Amino acid sequence: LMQGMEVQPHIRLRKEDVEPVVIIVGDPARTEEVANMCEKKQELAYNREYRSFRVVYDSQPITVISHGIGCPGTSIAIEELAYLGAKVIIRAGTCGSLKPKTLKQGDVCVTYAAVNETGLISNILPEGFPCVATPHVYQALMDAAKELGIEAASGIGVTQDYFYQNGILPSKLEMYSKCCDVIDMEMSGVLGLCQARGIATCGILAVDGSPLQWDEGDYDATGVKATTGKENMVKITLKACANLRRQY
Amino acid sequence: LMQGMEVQPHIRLRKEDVEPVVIIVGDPARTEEVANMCEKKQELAYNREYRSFRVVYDSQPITVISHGIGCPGTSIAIEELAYLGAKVIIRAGTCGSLKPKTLKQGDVCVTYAAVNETGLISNILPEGFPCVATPHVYQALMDAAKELGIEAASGIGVTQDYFYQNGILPSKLEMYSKCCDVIDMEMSGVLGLCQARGIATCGILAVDGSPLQWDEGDYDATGVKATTGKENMVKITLKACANLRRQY
Amino acid sequence: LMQGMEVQPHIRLRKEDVEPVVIIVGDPARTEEVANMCEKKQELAYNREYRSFRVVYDSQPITVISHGIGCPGTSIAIEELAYLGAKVIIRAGTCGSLKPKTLKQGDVCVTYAAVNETGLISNILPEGFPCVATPHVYQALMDAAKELGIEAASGIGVTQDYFYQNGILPSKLEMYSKCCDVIDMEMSGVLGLCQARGIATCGILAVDGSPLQWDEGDYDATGVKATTGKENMVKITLKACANLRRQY
Amino acid sequence: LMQGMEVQPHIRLRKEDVEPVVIIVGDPARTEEVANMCEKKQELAYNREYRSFRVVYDSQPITVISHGIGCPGTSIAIEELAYLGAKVIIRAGTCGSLKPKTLKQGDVCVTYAAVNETGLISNILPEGFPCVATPHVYQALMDAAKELGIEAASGIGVTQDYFYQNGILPSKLEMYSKCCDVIDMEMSGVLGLCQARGIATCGILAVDGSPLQWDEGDYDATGVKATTGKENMVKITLKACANLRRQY
Amino acid sequence: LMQGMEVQPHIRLRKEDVEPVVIIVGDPARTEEVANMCEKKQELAYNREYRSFRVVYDSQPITVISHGIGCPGTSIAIEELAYLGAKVIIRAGTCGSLKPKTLKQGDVCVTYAAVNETGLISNILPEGFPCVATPHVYQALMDAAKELGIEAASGIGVTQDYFYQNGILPSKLEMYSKCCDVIDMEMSGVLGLCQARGIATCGILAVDGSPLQWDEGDYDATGVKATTGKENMVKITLKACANLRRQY
Amino acid sequence: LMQGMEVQPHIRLRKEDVEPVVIIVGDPARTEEVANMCEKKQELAYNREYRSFRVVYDSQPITVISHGIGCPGTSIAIEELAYLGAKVIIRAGTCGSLKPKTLKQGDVCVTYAAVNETGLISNILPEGFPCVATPHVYQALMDAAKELGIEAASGIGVTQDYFYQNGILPSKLEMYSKCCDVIDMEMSGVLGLCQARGIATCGILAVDGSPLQWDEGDYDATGVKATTGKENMVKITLKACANLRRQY
Ligand SMILES: O=c1[nH]cnc2c([C@@H]3N[C@H](CO)[C@@H](O)[C@H]3O)c[nH]c12
Ligand SMILES: O=c1[nH]cnc2c([C@@H]3N[C@H](CO)[C@@H](O)[C@H]3O)c[nH]c12
Ligand SMILES: O=c1[nH]cnc2c([C@@H]3N[C@H](CO)[C@@H](O)[C@H]3O)c[nH]c12
Ligand SMILES: O=c1[nH]cnc2c([C@@H]3N[C@H](CO)[C@@H](O)[C@H]3O)c[nH]c12
Ligand SMILES: O=c1[nH]cnc2c([C@@H]3N[C@H](CO)[C@@H](O)[C@H]3O)c[nH]c12
Numbered sequence A, B, C, D, E, F: 001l002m003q004g005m006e007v008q009p010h011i012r013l014r015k016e017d018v019e020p021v022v023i024i025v026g027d028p029a030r031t032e033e034v035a036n037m038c039e040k041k042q043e044l045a046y047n048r049e050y051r052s053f054r055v056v057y058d059s060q061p062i063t064v065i066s067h068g069i070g071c072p073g074t075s076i077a078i079e080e081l082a083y084l085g086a087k088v089i090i091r092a093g094t095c096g097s098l099k100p101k102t103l104k105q106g107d108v109c110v111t112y113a114a115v116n117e118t119g120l121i122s123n124i125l126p127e128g129f130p131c132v133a134t135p136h137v138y139q140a141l142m143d144a145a146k147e148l149g150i151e152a153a154s155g156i157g158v159t160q161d162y163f164y165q166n167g168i169l170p171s172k173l174e175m176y177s178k179c180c181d182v183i184d185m186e187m188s189g190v191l192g193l194c195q196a197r198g199i200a201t202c203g204i205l206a207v208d209g210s211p212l213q214w215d216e217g218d219y220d221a222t223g224v225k226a227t228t229g230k231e232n233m234v235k236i237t238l239k240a241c242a243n244l245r246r247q248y
């Protein structure tokens, strides 16, 4: 006879450590930044790239945890969170703009879908599966942005299993720019895997540059524009998550 | 020097015949059924499988046109409608249920996305492109349903380039049923192509059977359950479309 | 215990309405044009894009039915016709030329094979399956053309799930032109599915333009050249079909 | 400034050594067997797996050359033959039966098409390209068979890049048997490459066993049944080739 | 005019911080464990999942840095390390056994190649590219193992973009077990990307369980067997890396 | 009840004719060239493209057999050799250079891996399988070259199912040149299939030209440079094989 593990092996959490609403972010440092915007915080665990907190925002307890860069490491956090009872997962991340005329450093984009280029989604779901947000979760993010008076684009992203565009094979970014708005490394994986696991999901992203213009120096992840965009994104996410959390 | 054609060659419409909001249906016969629910109707053209009306619902003029069975015939209608000024396209169709316990003949499902198995989308858009609805169009359909007090599921469909499941190669329906709610032959093509052409889009579908249970006689497209489901779908679609039409 | 349907659900025919030899055409209007070239005609049904006649040519009864634009809608007609006892199916359609120097508006091409770009054939048959005509059916068409003194090219076509060549992704027509003669939207589906169902098959197509030269206005489906080509194609098809019909 | 080579590097022939009609066979030994059925024979070259003769049959000069097992070695022979002026290429080979009830050791099958599973065709031609015979070449083979009173099946083959079916991955033969009659290792490559190079082409194959029943000993390449089948195939091929040769 | 960044944006290192020989490990915690086995250690940076040290082993300075779980996060580390002058990269990681009879918890396997199932390698290199070790780097690891008297298997791994095998689509592990010895989430990406960037490379892996037997509790990443295996792996890696470092 | 064949059907050998170490070459003529460098030789069989010898070099008996051009014909020899007890198979072949600056006619390259473009490996092994040499076999070849004072490059090759680069579709050689060293038509098939069958394997190739420069006449397979390269390759292979043979 077999038994479950006391603590999930990678995120090192037990079921009492996980709320039905979870905010996931790529960078362990951002979990603390989120926590510092809340009334109460408690750091739970920090193993590998997975740092977790319970936070209280608008009297609602929410889980905040880092997933690391890329779909594979993210798949582990999502599977372990799902086993522990997560019901809503929102990725609050950073991204490049593929529309440098209208989405610029500091801007926020709520991604209701993402073009999949990841090996994760290509192997765990049938070909042609849409990596799409749950409508009421997208609506909670947009309604939060509206209430706060914070501008938020609504867009389709593209997700790749790499950052740098160094070529044996031709870059696809020019083509992608003709049908989507932003680019990152986890979104289609998050949306797709959450849909597959019956977890309600959406993404929101703050722009740090444009890879179409990296050659002209359009990148500044640490700068004031990016820092302010991320702050705005977190304000929207926390508002939306307290509203969702109430339903559980 | 070249000039545009006076009437588009397949749908046989001119720009003055096309409203910015369009309802598309598979069957020529359904265009008249829609039109009979309106204050005013005018049949415009009927060429090949493309029968078109201008209708007035809640004082708003809306185009209604049939697209025929399958993505290819549908692609022609959408391309020619787009050239003529269509800004919003909603497919109001029929479908099979892949969730026979909960979605049955007569039920309506608003499809915010669809798994693509079509050659159309596989060839005109990059691999991994999400065939997804425009959020505000989905919201208009759901809000119309709520207002009318008509139950409408929210789901992900799958779209195939065939109807019958006679096999040399194994049927994929059991697998699709694990991650999809409904099945049809145009939705991913509509959503995907409209996204590509910058047309706001969504789908709504009335269930006529369950292909997982066709072998036990779970199909009745002409029956009272399916007929009532389609009537409900049309009520929701017309209400949502009048609201959308007002913004133009 | 289950029973068959009295009338097939889409084409709305019973087995007594279907001959072992069937001519299929994309446009419902062409079924009547064919019928008007015969000694006797009887319209049978008209549902959705499927209009059907029994015709008598050279004392032989033949079925004539429209299949609509594209492989998906066509697959339904072919499956339902096959269930009702069809043994020979010939598509008499229209097409673009990929050899604008030697195949021009008004010319006829008997297609003994087609390059498949359809989602239908890609999903129902193994990769690499040849969408090819049955030799004795091709021979009947060619022998009819010879007897009538009507010039008919012999060629390989390409079949796509779309008409317009509007690009996120590069058009493939230039490449296709280096290995085939004509382009349409149903041929590989017809040939492939018929082969799969053990139905003897071939295609014949009348040229209405060249998509390589659409930008220079090389398209005229309603014009005298195209109209005459279609008339010639129908004369060949009817002669060949009466000969085949005799064998049953 | 560059010049052509005097003799082609693999087959080691000059243009005066090559007739416009060529019979290709897999085994060097079969070139002599063919030549022994003719009025006159002259061995030309033998390099690697490529052994060549000029033969005279019914007063017509024809090239006979071996291509070796598999599409890659065969591609070299065809390319070099084409450079030297070949206009018609017919493969007279051996094969397995996928229809063991009706096609048995000693039987002959004229293959007007073949399912492609070769890397050759997958890489040199677009996906979905039909590996198909030239109708008038198929007709010459069938007419020769009819004249000789030798039974010849007409069928579709499948071509693979291997012979043995030892598995890490599942064998596909049972599936192929639903839609194909025979199996070999060169046919789709011959038909496809000849089509691409504008060479008129067809295949004819003598059955030596059934791989579906190899486990029960259904294989005898050297036996009297197979030897007689190959003799019959050669009789048909030589007769058809003399007729074709006359047109040049 | 553009300039390079002073510190690379993700790993936060400058060229003077990077040695030509680099050991990469998945877990930030393992960088310290490696460093504790050396004569001298200096922690350099810790940003996101990227923690780095300079270590001195057998008088040779070597970089040690964590890459996080999965190819995408790893690609960033390798690209930025390569820009900074890395010439040799060895992944010292953990893995599952696909050969549970012979490779068990605590065992070490030097992987000279890996089956690629990653989106990274599928998109940055041509199809069929071998994710393979540089022979002299493999030899340095094996020679170090032989010198130390520590048993090390030599094998081929498989790399996937996920850890958990929860299925909508069938698990491929049983098939992989026929042709692979171990399974992890980064190896094919490391080997393949290093080959592409002209970095000499190999992998070594300590077994922590067998996913074929996870259902029977064959997993213990923190246990004494796995801990000893990792210690042995590190001993081999440090010895091989000092030898390699000397050549620069 | 079934029995094995006395003599394998294609190579026409019995188990007593096959040594555990086998040298395979594409050209039947090269088997004799190899044999003439040995103390003792015995020709065993010659059927189709498969000519075989037992040779004695440095008192060790080794099998030498031709496999013909291309993976398919080669797969037969390898399967039949494996059934007869072959344990080590080394391909000693010829190749084109993709690095015309540093690998030129007459140069030798030991290929420890090959990019797969063959239909053989694509169908018998999972996607992403590395076609890689067995490390100790590569080491035996390199150690032989070092001992003999013969320069030998160490490289990754690419293997295609064709020789000539004649285009419907764009040539891939320019891209391949950015990630590998040499090009041939059997290597990935040999390495991959041997790995699959548990046979230890490596490849060594002598350069006869550069296909990137065929247009400038960079090809001379019969010339003194190529002839000397092949002689050098054979000297290395025979030395390495006698060493390996001793272990059995
Ligand atoms: O321009 C970009 N391209 C790809 N990914 C990202 C990101 C996101 N942040 C991380 C990379 O810095 C990674 O998690 C990715 O999802 C920000 N900007 C870009
Ligand atoms: O059970 C089903 N499977 C696939 N398509 C459909 C449909 C839709 N209606 C048409 C086929 O009846 C076609 O347009 C398809 O999209 C209704 N039910 C089903
Ligand atoms: O130039 C062309 N490209 C693609 N299809 C067609 C057709 C055929 N006629 C219909 C489109 O008008 C459709 O059934 C297609 O098969 C005529 N011309 C062309
Ligand atoms: O049962 C079979 N399977 C696959 N190929 C062949 C052949 C043909 N003959 C050669 C293999 O014996 C090869 O050229 C292949 O095309 C005969 N029988 C069979
Ligand atoms: O059984 C396994 N399957 C897949 N990956 C891993 C690993 C490796 N360690 C991390 C997951 O624990 C990840 O980096 C992966 O590469 C250890 N064991 C296994």
Ligand SMILES: O=c1[nH]cnc2c([C@@H]3N[C@H](CO)[C@@H](O)[C@H]3O)c[nH]c12
Pocket: F026, F068, F069, F070, F093, F094, F095, F096, F097, F162, F163, F183, F184, F185, F186, F208, F209, F210, F211
């Ligand atoms: O430049 C080349 N391209 C492809 N193959 C080869 C060869 C090898 N020799 C044979 C072709 O001559 C074939 O077996 C192939 O593997 C030599 N040179 C080249």
